[PDB]
Symmetry: C4
Subunit: 22 residues, 4 copies
């Protein structure tokens, strides 16, 4: 489902931004 | 699905902290 | 739901272990 | 709910990396 899926992607993107910093 | 969403808010929030706090 | 919820908790706990390291 | 679970595996995996890699 839509609002769950978007927040999952958002989390993935936050983790992608963190991966980079590290 | 209110529990899953609630946990994803918390997670999202923990990561935006961690983010910033880096 | 059960296997989704456990993995959400697991993630929270990983983030708790990360919070500490940081 | 196979998509949500799949995204949670990926996330879990990204965090155990980040973990370790710290």
């Amino acid at each position: 489902x839509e609002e769950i899926l978007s927040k999952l992607y958002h989390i993935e993107n936050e983790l992608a931004r963190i991966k980079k910093l590290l």
